Design a protein around this ligand. Structure first.
Ligand SMILES: *[C@@H]1O[C@H](CO[C@H]2O[C@@H](C)[C@@H](O)[C@@H](O)[C@@H]2O)[C@@H](O[C@@H]2O[C@H](CO)[C@@H](O[C@@H]3O[C@H](CO[C@H]4O[C@H](CO)[C@@H](O)[C@H](O)[C@@H]4O[C@@H]4O[C@H](CO)[C@@H](O[C@@H]5O[C@H](CO)[C@H](O)[C@H](O)[C@H]5O)[C@H](O)[C@H]4NC(C)=O)[C@@H](O)[C@H](O[C@H]4O[C@H](CO)[C@@H](O)[C@H](O)[C@@H]4O[C@@H]4O[C@H](CO)[C@@H](O)[C@H](O)[C@H]4NC(C)=O)[C@@H]3O)[C@H](O)[C@H]2NC(C)=O)[C@H](O)[C@H]1NC(C)=O
Ligand SMILES: *[C@@H]1O[C@H](CO)[C@@H](O[C@@H]2O[C@H](CO)[C@@H](O[C@@H]3O[C@H](CO[C@H]4O[C@H](CO)[C@@H](O)[C@H](O)[C@@H]4O[C@@H]4O[C@H](CO)[C@@H](O[C@@H]5O[C@H](CO)[C@H](O)[C@H](O)[C@H]5O)[C@H](O)[C@H]4NC(C)=O)[C@@H](O)[C@H](O[C@H]4O[C@H](CO)[C@@H](O)[C@H](O)[C@@H]4O[C@@H]4O[C@H](CO)[C@@H](O)[C@H](O)[C@H]4NC(C)=O)[C@@H]3O)[C@H](O)[C@H]2NC(C)=O)[C@H](O)[C@H]1NC(C)=O
Ligand SMILES: *[C@@H]1O[C@H](CO)[C@@H](O)[C@H](O)[C@H]1NC(C)=O
Ligand SMILES: *[C@@H]1O[C@H](CO)[C@@H](O)[C@H](O)[C@H]1NC(C)=O
Ligand SMILES: C[C@@H]1O[C@@H](O)[C@@H](O)[C@H](O)[C@@H]1O
Lengths: 209, 157, 208
């Protein structure tokens, strides 16, 4: 009957890096005017908490209001396994809708990172490809980025984590540059952030030898 | 003597209960055939494609009234496809076997004009020009997302 | 008010290489015991065919039936994009349920294949990786395999196709060996089957 509720987790980067602030988002959908007021109760580890900022119903394309509540979460709260629960009261739901979300359970494993240069075969082309291989990590949640002598490079795509035969995960990030950029001997870096690394960071560099 | 429907809806899905009351201040006809009934009003147990076409009535003391037995999950029902402005428009997202629908959306030209949590009728309290167009309802049957046949609406002069 | 109908496509190997037999699988689900009889009408580009074979109904676990029909498709009757329609008649549904499936609409693009050896950094471990990079191909459907001097290797997993910033797709296949072999030094070759290749096949090999 609705409304339907979805609850989302912090992007990993926010959680891993102290500078940033992570948050858990509770999204509510399909809300009628006849029943447009929505209540939020937020819980951490079953103890209610108060510090969430509910945004305004933003009415949708399809004649439905949309509401959202955001909670601000501590870093060592989330990385420690805490359960975050959202309870939505509304005058169309007979009983409130609880959705809860938490970190992925299991021993963490520190990823090993490798950068791989372009295939000789590739050079014949306008642009070459640079590959960052991250493998050996649990949980799936990781952040991977590229940069060239300081700026974030902007032509890379990353494949979603792949479950390895050994219970760890892996991924490949392909950064695309111009062969000209390549020969000169420019320095390129693949940047990896995961909970299982010191400082929740490591860097691996790729240029010509 | 005018034939009179109840529910008026001239458009119906299969497994619908249709009534035809004849008004005077009885003998019947379907597709110019004799309806069995003599009584002051004839009854359709359950709609079927068979029962389409024209219907007439003649009390001892009429001009046709059409019937469409459509088939599917949803049927958008309105008394007419043409109204002139400042005219209530009443739409009904009628479901197969009056099935409990939920999350119902009425639309126009592919565009959500209204929404409900449960199967409720659509009123445009007074008809503007911007209203006329291409309509259909959609909702949830069981766990199945379904949609009604399309209808054309027209506001004039 | 059911039952539902999901209609699957052939795996790409079956469609690409002649030898195999590609088939669309129209599986009907949530079929109630009260309404268990299930009829299939199959259409190709709107024209009916009857070379489909409805399999024995398999009672499922939630105390609901599950049924399956397969249509066998000519190899180029799919690469040409013909729409396969599967019409399920039944008395739980007021109107038969039609589902359709077809080829990814759009110009095909030649996959580029590149084989990448391990990192100088990975050699320091008991097992290294060999990477096959397949990029620049449309449509999404592809097949990627590894071999060793001709024979099939058994230690690789494959990334899902990823939409590239130029309308193409790409992916990665990570073959894993023990260190010794790489230095053995053995030839390995990642093989790719796709509709935009000569003979629908190509191979790129890796040695020291
Ligand atoms: C009326 O119109 C409504 C809105 O319409 C719009 O949206 C589109 C339709 C568009 O085309 C336009 O029409 C218009 O824009 C419409 O509402 C829609 O309802 C759907 C059905 O309920 C919703 O689908 C769900 O989507 C979930 C995923 O949501 C994310 O991704 C979508 C798609 O990209 C995106 O739109 C959402 O915003 C959301 O994105 C994430 O959002 C969070 C929060 O903002 C971000 O996180 C925060 O970001 C900030 C940044 O400042 C900061 O970093 C914070 O730290 C961070 O927390 C994310 O960044 C962002 N991520 C991304 C990638 O964008 C699905 O999860 C969900 O799927 C589950 O449920 C399905 C059944 O309902 C099921 O089939 C599916 O398998 C899945 O299942 C679950 O399955 C899991 C495993 O598979 C299990 O683990 C679970 O146990 C299981 N759970 C359950 C309960 O089963 C679902 O599909 C849709 O989101 C929603 N759209 C919008 C815009 O809200 C409505 O339906 C219409 N009504 C009618 C009648 O038509
Ligand atoms: C009672 O208990 C029942 C029993 O288990 C239960 O039945 C299930 O119902 C589910 C629905 O409630 C149904 O879920 C659907 O699953 C679809 C994918 O199913 C495949 O993968 C599953 C694993 O995730 C398997 O478990 C399935 O069996 C199925 O497996 C595939 O099977 C085919 C044919 O058998 C096979 O192909 C053939 O393989 C051979 C190999 O031997 C050859 O290669 C042949 O050449 C080849 O043809 C596949 O290989 C095999 N795949 C795999 C991975 O094994 C899933 O796609 C459905 O999602 C769609 O619909 C939902 C709406 O519900 C959407 O939200 C979702 O986005 C999907 O929509 C699709 O989106 C596409 C875009 O990405 C779009 O293009 C499509 O148009 C769109 N489709 C639709 C219709 O909208 C869906 O989740 C589940 O499969 C049923 N289980 C079984 C075993 O069938 C029943 O529900 C229970 N009922 C109750 C009341 O409890
Ligand atoms: C009457 O005509 C309609 C078509 O207008 C047809 O569907 C129906 O079967 C006919 N019924 C009889 C009794 O002739
Ligand atoms: C209905 O299915 C359609 C698919 O186009 C979708 O727009 C809508 O979100 C679904 N749900 C409802 C309740 O109409
Ligand atoms: C009863 C059902 O069987 C089928 C599967 O898709 C699910 O695992 C479920 O358990």
């Amino acid at each position: 009957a609705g409304p339907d509720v979805f609850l989302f987790p912090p992007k990993p980067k926010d959680t891993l890096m102290i500078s940033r602030t992570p948050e858990v988002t509770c999204v509510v959908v399909d809300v009628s005017h006849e029943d447009p007021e929505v209540k939020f109760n937020w819980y951490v580890d079953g103890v209610e908490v108060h510090n969430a900022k509910t945004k305004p119903r933003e009415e949708q394309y399809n004649s439905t209001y949309r509401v959202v509540s955001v909670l601000t979460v501590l870093h060592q709260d989330w990385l420690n396994g805490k359960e975050y629960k959202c309870k939505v009261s509304n005058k169309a739901l007979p009983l409130p809708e609880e959705k809860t979300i938490s970190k992925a359970k299991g021993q963490p494993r520190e990823p090993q990172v490798y950068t791989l240069p372009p295939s000789r075969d590739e050079l014949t082309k306008n642009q070459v490809s640079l590959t960052c291989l991250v493998k050996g990590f649990y949980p799936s949640d990781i952040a991977v980025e590229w940069e060239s002598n300081g700026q974030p490079e902007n032509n890379y795509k990353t494949t979603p984590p792949v479950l390895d035969s050994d219970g760890s995960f892996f991924l490949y990030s392909k950064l695309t540059v111009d062969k000209s950029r390549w020969q000169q001997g420019n320095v390129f870096s693949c940047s990896v952030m995961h909970e299982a690394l010191h400082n929740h960071y490591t860097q691996k560099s790729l240029s010509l030898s | 003597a005018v034939v009179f429907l109840e529910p008026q809806w001239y458009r119906v899905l299969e497994k619908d209960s249709v009534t035809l009351k004849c008004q005077g201040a009885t003998q019947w006809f379907h597709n110019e055939s004799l309806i069995s009934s003599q009584a002051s009003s004839y009854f359709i147990d359950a709609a079927t494609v068979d029962d389409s076409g024209e219907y007439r009535c003649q009390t001892q003391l009429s001009d046709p009234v059409q019937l469409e037995v459509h088939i599917g999950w949803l049927l958008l029902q309105a008394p007419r496809w043409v109204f002139k402005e400042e005219d209530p428009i009443h739409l009904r997202c009628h479901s197969w076997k009056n099935t409990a629908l939920h999350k119902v959306t009425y639309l126009q030209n592919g565009k959500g004009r209204k929404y409900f949590h449960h199967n409720s009728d659509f009123y445009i309290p007074k008809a503007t020009l911007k209203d006329s167009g291409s309509y259909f309802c959609r909702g949830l049957f069981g766990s199945k997302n379904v949609s009604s046949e399309t209808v054309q609406i027209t506001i004039t002069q």
